Design a protein around this ligand. Structure first.
Ligand SMILES: [Mg+2]
Ligand SMILES: [Mg+2]
Ligand SMILES: [Mg+2]
Ligand SMILES: [Mg+2]
Ligand SMILES: [Mg+2]
Ligand SMILES: [Mg+2]
Ligand SMILES: [Mg+2]
Ligand SMILES: [Mg+2]
Ligand SMILES: [Mg+2]
Ligand SMILES: [Mg+2]
Ligand SMILES: [Mg+2]
Ligand SMILES: [Mg+2]
Ligand SMILES: [Mg+2]
Ligand SMILES: [Mg+2]
Ligand SMILES: [Mg+2]
Ligand SMILES: [Mg+2]
Lengths: 116, 127, 100, 99, 208, 151, 83
RNA sequence: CCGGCCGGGAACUCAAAGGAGACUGCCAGUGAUAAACUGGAGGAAGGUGGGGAUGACGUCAAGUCAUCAUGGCCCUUACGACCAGGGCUACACACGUGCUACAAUGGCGCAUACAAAGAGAAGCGACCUCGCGAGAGCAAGCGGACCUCAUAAAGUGCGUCGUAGUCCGGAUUGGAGUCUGCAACUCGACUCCAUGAAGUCGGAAUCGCUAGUAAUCGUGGAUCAGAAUGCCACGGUGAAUAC
RNA sequence: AAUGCCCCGUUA
């Protein structure tokens, strides 16, 4: 099953199959299924092509993988080009929301780097 | 002619009223299978009526408050035992040997300063 | 604490009690969902102009006997140390060492 | 009817005060309900007893506010001004409520 | 420091509360502050009078202050002037009509605070702390206290290394709870710093 | 402990069959106080094992416990200038508890899907003298036999 | 973020100063300490010297910064590297 | 009006308030005719019935001159006082204490049962309406066994997931917002959408606990305009083992 | 019948 320019798990239920898309969570997927008039537990394998076309129309009405890539990249680039606090944090690899950094910032700082 | 009894547990309190009948049960305007949806609760509330074979001779209108399912079950058992005392006055030794008249005083222990709980101390370390 | 800090807190509470009404009605007209945009703008501007010490959120609760800002107890108005010493001396009515 | 709510930190004091109240009531008026005892408040406090640093050393105080309620259902003219003239001990808060 | 306050631990069983009044959370704090200020002013004003204990009770918007002292003739001075001045000033302080009562406490050698203030005056006038403690204990046991302990601490005799001494006579049980333990303390401000003093007086067990 | 020996606390038998042994087994299997879940699991697995191997739940459980039951454990003595791993006999309560513990541990280690299935498979294997439970039993027996030179 | 209904916050003195500056057409560093004020479209083309502790750092206001605050562009903690 | 509702009833839970009771009291044995120990008859509790408070002489010249008080020393157009902003939240790194997880005794959706202990007047804040939501408008009652906070959760029954770094994990990040507060960039909390790191039980070593304890599950309060996974309290389920 | 071990600066 190919949707929004990407394949889709065939054996998984419709909800998780759609969540597999970049830009669609459980709630957005449930809304897609409701708008398409399909059960949340119907496997994509047993589905017909018209339902898949409706799902394509709905995901097109919403935003998709490459669109989100571009939006996020452009936002981060605008930030780090303005040189605001958030852009500085982004470029330096440190947390942005204002977390502590004297310890316990591994998600952004990557693994530990011993001093030598 | 109803015989009354009071049972108590951790935080529960059960009023038991017994009348000679067919042996039906009513807990808070419900049956035991509907109130105590647990086989252990059912067995413990039925215990004394099997200790002394009178499960089918006395109906009873029981009410209970406070505590959880097991606490309420123990309270109902204690109240049923007390009512059986008030009614017969001859099964006292049997229920004593069975261990039913002793009101369980195993109350929940409080939390003390310097401890994570009643007895658990925080993590200790020389360094 | 320092006499300067205590007098500072006194001035804070005095100015708060003074500008309470005006600040209150200004906040009211600002939060008013059925108010004009320009009126709310002017109200926010006047609130800005108003002194900062006039805000009840600016004053810190201090022990009425020593000025200690930490360990304050609203029920008594004293720090924990003074509360304990007064209780032991028998000055706080009804208060006694508890246990259960 | 009139309800009298007494409260105090002293058990014996509140008990003697409500006793005096019910006595004067049965004396002047008649048909006083009774001094029913209500649940008492237990306002607790924990205080670090050390000045600088001891987070495990802590005293635990508590104020016990005992509460009593009495009701008079046949209020005469003299009963009201009598209980109003009556000044009670220090440490007892009395609240009158008609109805 | 481990010992608990005797008055604090006995405040419910045998020993009573000094301040005895009821209040809600809205005025508890200001009531405490007014009581503190009243006690402060009284202790500051009548210091040459052997004031043992100032108790306060505020029933129905009227404060009543009872001063248990040993020199009532002094606290009153000329008959009807000093008490009235104190009543007026304390009423002004509290913002409430004031009433003043005096309680003559016999046997001033049996009060924890009076003995403490006496020792304080002694070792502020440079009397030997040992002699002061010994004579206090002797006077108490002579007047008939079933027990007495008195301890001094800090810069004893202008020493450079502070220490603590204590004299015990009779039977003063503190672990017991029904015992009548009148305990108090004071401090002297000498050229060499501060000297603290504590006094326990065991009158007798109270079987209530 | 040092001072005194203690008295044993009572354990309520199970409602389904009334076996104090099964009550102890479910109390060993439970975790975080979820006795309801433990009872459901043990009852399901026991019914499965029964309909599998014929004889009723009690017979299957007792034969499995007997096949897993040890008789001689090993302890440390540290008498004098030498330390000894002396073998010592086991008492009934101790060996029953050890059997139950080894069985539940083998079930936990087994990489099946459901805990009830794991427990049923382990019980069947033990009844037919298979599984890590009987494995550990044989290991401790061999260790005791090796250290049999101490008494 | 601040409440939408409340509107954007800006200091009265900063607003009056920027009004005077845009009316006068003077291209001078507008010194201020209001790092909390959010930028407005009237500030584009100007240069604001906002306090950052030690001194006032100058920032030239652009369009895409309007929805931001000058504290975002005035850093305070000077860090280079531990070694 | 099927709701103790509202007459009524004072029985019961419950609320205190005062009392009774548990003191080796009695029985048999051991013991040196003792202390005391063992066992049992009663009893709710049997041997300190459980828990708490209560912490001797003194040690560590232990901690606190930044709670407070205080000797001596030190500054007196500043080591005093006021104001704005920033910082106390930084970050190659190491350690301690905790929370969340690695999952199927589980996750998810539906329905549903059982508590205790506490706060409330610059406060708690029903109901109704709007908004997916945080919350917003109106807004009764409550100084409170009466009203609010406030729905307890684990559990139970049904269906699904079927051992997959996954419908586990939720960190990080982007976008739009709510509340407080003059003012949420440095630097609050929370909501919605999307994103979905590491982790697949953890080396040496090491910690807590003997029963309603551990383990687990939630609830409340002090601080507080706003701001806890911490602190202090309450209860539900509820073990194993001690030769 | 006798598997681990060695050390703590100066004055007071
Ligand atoms: Mg933070
Ligand atoms: Mg360690
Ligand atoms: Mg000062
Ligand atoms: Mg209350
Ligand atoms: Mg102590
Ligand atoms: Mg016995
Ligand atoms: Mg400042
Ligand atoms: Mg800090
Ligand atoms: Mg955990
Ligand atoms: Mg609160
Ligand atoms: Mg469930
Ligand atoms: Mg991995
Ligand atoms: Mg999301
Ligand atoms: Mg796995
Ligand atoms: Mg918790
Ligand atoms: Mg050497």
């Amino acid at each position: 099953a190919r949707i929004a320019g990407i394949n889709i798990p065939d054996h998984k239920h419709a909800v998780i199959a759609l969540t597999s898309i970049y830009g669609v969570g459980k709630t957005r997927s449930k809304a897609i299924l409701a708008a398409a008039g399909i059960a949340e537990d119907v496997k994509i394998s047993e589905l017909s092509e018209g339902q898949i076309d409706t799902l394509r129309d709905e995901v097109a009405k919403f935003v998709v993988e490459g669109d989100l890539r571009r939006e996020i990249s452009m936002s981060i680039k605008r930030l780090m080009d303005l040189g605001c606090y958030r852009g500085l944090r982004h470029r330096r690899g440190l947390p942005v929301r204002g977390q502590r950094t004297k310890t316990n910032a591994r998600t952004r700082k990557g693994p530990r780097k011993p001093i030598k | 002619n109803q015989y009354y009894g009071t049972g108590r547990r951790k935080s529960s309190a059960a009023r038991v009223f017994i009348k000679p009948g067919n042996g039906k049960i009513v807990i808070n305007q419900r049956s035991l299978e509907q109130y105590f949806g647990r086989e252990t609760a059912r067995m413990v509330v039925r215990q004394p009526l099997e200790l002394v074979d009178m499960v089918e001779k006395l109906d009873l209108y029981i009410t209970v408050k406070g505590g959880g399912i097991s606490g309420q079950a123990g309270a109902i058992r204690h109240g049923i035992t007390r009512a059986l005392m008030e009614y017969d006055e001859s099964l006292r030794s049997e229920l004593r040997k069975a261990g039913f008249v002793t009101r369980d005083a195993r109350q929940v222990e409080r939390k003390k300063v310097g401890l994570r709980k009643a007895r658990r101390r925080p993590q200790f370390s020389k360094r | 604490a320092k006499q300067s800090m205590k007098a500072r807190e006194v001035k804070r509470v005095a100015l708060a009690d003074k500008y309470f009404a005006k600040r209150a009605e200004l906040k009211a007209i600002i939060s008013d969902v059925n108010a004009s945009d320009e009126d709310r703008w002017n109200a926010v501007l006047k609130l800005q102009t108003l002194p900062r010490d006039s805000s009840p959120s600016r004053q810190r609760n201090r022990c009425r006997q020593t000025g200690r800002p930490h360990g304050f107890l609203r029920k008594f108005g004293l720090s924990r140390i003074k509360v304990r010493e007064a209780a032991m001396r028998g000055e706080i009515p009804g208060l006694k060492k508890a246990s259960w | 009817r009139i309800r009298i709510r007494l409260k105090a930190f002293d058990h014996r004091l509140i008990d003697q005060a409500t006793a005096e109240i019910v006595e004067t009531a049965k004396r002047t008026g008649a048909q006083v309900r009774g001094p029913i005892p209500l649940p008492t408040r237990k306002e607790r406090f924990t205080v670090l007893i050390s000045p600088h640093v001891n987070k495990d050393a802590r005293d635990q105080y508590e104020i016990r506010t005992h509460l009593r309620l009495v009701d008079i259902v046949e209020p005469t003219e003299k009963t009201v001004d009598a209980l109003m003239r009556l000044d009670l001990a220090a440490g007892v808060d009395v609240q009158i409520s008609l109805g | 420091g481990q010992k608990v306050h005797p008055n604090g631990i006995r405040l419910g069983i045998v020993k009573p509360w000094n301040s005895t009044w009821f209040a809600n959370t809205k005025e508890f704090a200001d009531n405490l502050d007014s009581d503190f200020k009243v006690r402060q002013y009284l202790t500051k004003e009548l210091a040459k009078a052997s004031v043992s204990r100032i108790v306060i009770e505020r029933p129905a918007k009227s404060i009543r202050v009872t001063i248990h002292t040993a020199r009532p003739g002094i606290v009153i001075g000329k008959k009807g002037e000093d008490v009235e001045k104190l009543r007026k000033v304390v009423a002004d302080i509290a913002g409430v009509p004031a009433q003043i009562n005096i309680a003559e406490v016999r046997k001033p050698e049996l009060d924890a605070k009076l003995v403490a203030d006496s020792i304080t005056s002694q070792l502020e006038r440079r009397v030997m702390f040992r002699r002061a403690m010994k004579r206090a204990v002797q006077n108490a046991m002579r007047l008939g206290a079933k027990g007495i302990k008195v301890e001094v601490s800090g810069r004893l005799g202008g020493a450079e290394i502070a220490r603590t001494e204590w004299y015990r006579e009779g039977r003063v049980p503190l672990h017991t709870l029904r015992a009548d333990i009148d305990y108090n303390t004071s401090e002297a401000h000498t050229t060499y710093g501060v000297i603290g003093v504590k006094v326990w007086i065991f009158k007798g067990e109270i079987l209530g | 402990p040092r001072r005194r020996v203690i008295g044993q606390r009572k354990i309520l038998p199970d409602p389904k069959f009334g076996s104090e042994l099964l009550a102890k087994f479910v109390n060993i299997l439970m975790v975080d106080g979820k006795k309801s879940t433990a009872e459901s699991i043990v009852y399901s697995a026991l019914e499965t094992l029964a309909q599998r191997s014929g004889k009723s739940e009690l017979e299957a459980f007792e034969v499995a416990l007997e096949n897993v039951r040890p008789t001689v454990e090993v302890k440390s003595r540290r008498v004098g200038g030498s330390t000894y791993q002396v073998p010592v006999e086991v008492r009934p309560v101790r060996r029953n508890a050890l059997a139950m513990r080894w069985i539940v541990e083998a079930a936990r280690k087994r990489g099946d899907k459901s805990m009830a299935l794991r427990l049923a498979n382990e019980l069947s294997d033990a009844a037919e003298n298979k599984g890590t439970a009987v494995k550990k039993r044989e290991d401790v027996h061999r260790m005791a036999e090796a250290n049999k030179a101490f008494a | 973020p601040r409440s939408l209904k409340k509107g954007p916050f800006i200091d009265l003195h900063l607003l009056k100063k920027v009004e005077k500056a845009v009316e006068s057409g003077d291209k001078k560093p507008l010194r201020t300490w209001s790092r909390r004020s959010t930028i407005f479209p009237n500030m584009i083309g100007l240069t604001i010297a906002v306090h950052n502790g030690r001194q006032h750092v100058p920032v030239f206001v652009t369009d895409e910064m309007v929805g931001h605050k000058l504290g975002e562009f005035a850093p305070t903690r000077t860090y280079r590297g531990h070694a």
